[PDB]
């Protein structure tokens, strides 16, 4: 196009806006991180099976694998430090990077089939790639549940615990398609932490009208399977302080992660703790703030499952 010679060169995803709410910035550290994650992913792609990854919509990656891969370590000196300070940014960077490797792999797929069998199109073929999000498991710190406090909030942490409870899968709308009343264009809006929100301004540049229509029916809306697991630290009675119940921290699963959890089984969940929604401080402005930490699982790793 006029703006960029290659759609990919200017923006890693050709459909950048739908995939990423954030706009591309050359200056921003996140784009460099995406490149490092991508390079690591390209090296690990041969091990990965493309078809399996495409159906899953997610790829499980060990934190140990991430640390071992050279490019990520070179670009950001400590992956772990980066994860605690900006958990969302790093997780998103990882997801875009794997998705980009997959888009490139899809382009490669088209090229190889065209070479193998003569095609009328012979190139010029649209390639369809499902959204892929990186999953991180076996995060190194492995902090205990008792340690978690107000300071711990906002930092990506790994929790060692046994889930005792599971919840029935509930589809959660990661993105809700929104059509402004005065504009033909409809754009999906990411819901922060799967929580309903309305953009003040319409995404389309030509019309900025506030009013929106929620197109749940439309394919543009994205629904991701979501699960909730209550995970409690497990300790020997002698090891634990006597007379105090083991702390239980709510954890959640998304996409392919869901349904890999069975109650009574020890599963390590790695992800970012978040201040609890629907609590009195959150619900009411000018109210006493009472909050609890709920941690998403970037990846699911089950010690019991591995056995």
């Amino acid at each position: 196009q006029s703006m960029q010679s290659t759609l990919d060169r200017f923006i890693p995803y050709k459909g950048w806006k739908l995939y990423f709410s954030e706009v591309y910035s050359d200056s921003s550290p996140l784009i460099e991180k995406i490149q490092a994650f991508e390079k690591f992913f390209t090296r690990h792609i041969d091990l990965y099976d493309k078809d399996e990854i495409e159906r899953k919509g997610s790829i499980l990656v060990d934190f140990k694998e991430l640390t071992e891969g050279g490019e990520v370590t070179n670009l950001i000196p400590d992956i772990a430090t980066e994860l605690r300070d900006a958990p969302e940014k790093t997780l998103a960077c990882m997801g875009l990077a794997i998705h980009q490797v997959l888009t490139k792999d899809l382009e490669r797929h088209a090229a190889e089939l065209q070479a193998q069998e003569g095609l009328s199109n012979d190139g010029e073929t649209m390639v369809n790639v499902p959204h892929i999000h990186a999953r991180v498991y076996n995060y190194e710190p492995l902090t205990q549940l008792k340690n978690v406090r107000a300071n711990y909030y906002g930092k990506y942490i790994a929790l060692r615990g046994t889930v005792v409870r599971v919840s029935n899968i509930k589809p959660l709308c990661t993105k809700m398609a929104f059509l402004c009343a005065a504009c033909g264009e409809i754009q999906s809006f990411p819901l922060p932490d799967g929580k309903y929100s309305l953009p003040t301004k319409c995404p389309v540049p030509v019309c900025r009208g506030r009013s929106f229509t929620a197109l749940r029916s439309s394919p543009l809306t994205v629904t991701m399977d979501w699960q909730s697991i209550k995970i409690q630290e497990l300790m020997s009675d002698d090891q634990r302080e006597a007379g105090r119940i083991p702390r239980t921290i709510e954890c959640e699963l998304v996409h392919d992660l869901v349904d890999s959890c069975v109650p009574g089984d020890t599963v390590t969940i790695t992800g970012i703790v978040k201040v609890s929604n629907a609590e009195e401080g959150s619900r009411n402005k000018n109210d006493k703030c009472m909050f609890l930490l709920y941690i998403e699982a970037n990846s699911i790793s089950n010690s019991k499952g591995q056995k």
Partner: protein, 276 residues
């Protein structure tokens, strides 16, 4: 779904109906109640053999294809009406629904596990034993909300996606911009029998044998509609042929919104009954 193709798909169904459903048409003539919901049972595999296009189309858009089949059924009924010596003697039902049976097995077409959000909009066959059956309720399929100034909106369908509830719109429903302060729902004061539709939810539960030992079987609500309602009984394993759908709780700003997986069932055939 190209429009010209849609007529062609209907034509293919109509020819298939003549050979396959002469008996079904005789049954349709025998029941004289058009308002009562009635089912014509079509074996999917034979129809798919007659038209390759129809088979592919059904998989991508089951709801649209079912609608085409229903339109063809009305056309088939009028031709049968003409063929019969007395048009009056043969009875044609407005509520005639093609019921898909004997689907060729495909992972998408027949999936044993409880359906997921990814599978929404795709036909699925799941054998289901229902743990809980809710009481029958009637919720209007279409509500006659009318914008008085516009004079153009009648029988607007209730939105299934929003928890099977229509939402009254401040903006005029019709494209023409003639907003009115007063919106009147004819259905709300008095509902026509056609306007309303039966609504039921059954908690289809995964069979224990299918699931791994020590793992809880998943349970999903299944919509039962029209003639199919009440055929299923709790504690009975019946194959459910249906298209998956999503039901959304009303959204609230700054709080999480809940989406619930659900399946609308096109056809109900009980495997337990088949086993006999």
């Amino acid at each position: 779904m190209n429009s010209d193709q849609v007529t062609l798909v209907g034509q293919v169904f109509e020819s298939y109906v003549s050979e396959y459903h002469k008996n079904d048409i005789l049954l349709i003539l025998k029941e004289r109640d058009e308002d009562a919901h009635y089912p014509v049972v079509v074996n999917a595999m034979t129809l798919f053999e007659t038209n390759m296009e129809i088979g592919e189309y059904f998989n991508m858009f089951p709801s649209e294809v079912l609608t085409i089949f229903d339109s063809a059924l009305r056309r088939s009924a009028l031709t049968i009406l003409q063929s019969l010596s007395q048009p009056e003697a043969v009875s044609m039902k407005q509520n005639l629904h093609a019921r898909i049976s004997g689907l060729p097995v495909c992972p998408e077409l027949v999936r044993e596990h409880i359906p997921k959000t990814k599978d929404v909009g795709h036909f699925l066959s799941v054998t289901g034993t229902v743990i809980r059956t809710s009481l029958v309720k009637v919720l209007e399929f279409e509500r006659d909300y009318m914008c008085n100034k516009c004079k153009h909106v009648f029988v607007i369908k209730a939105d299934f996606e929003q928890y099977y509830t229509f939402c009254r719109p401040s903006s005029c429903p019709s494209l023409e911009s003639c907003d009115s302060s007063k919106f009147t729902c004819l259905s709300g004061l008095s509902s026509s029998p056609t306007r309303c539709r039966d609504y039921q939810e059954i908690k289809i539960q995964e069979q224990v044998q299918r699931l791994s030992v020590g793992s809880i079987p998943r349970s999903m609500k299944v919509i039962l509609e029209d003639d199919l309602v009440d055929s299923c009984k709790s504690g009975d394993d019946l194959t459910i042929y249906g298209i998956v759908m999503q039901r959304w709780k009303p959204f609230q700003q700054d709080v999480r919104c809940e989406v619930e997986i659900v399946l609308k069932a096109n056809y109900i055939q009980v495997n337990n009954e088949q086993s006999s």
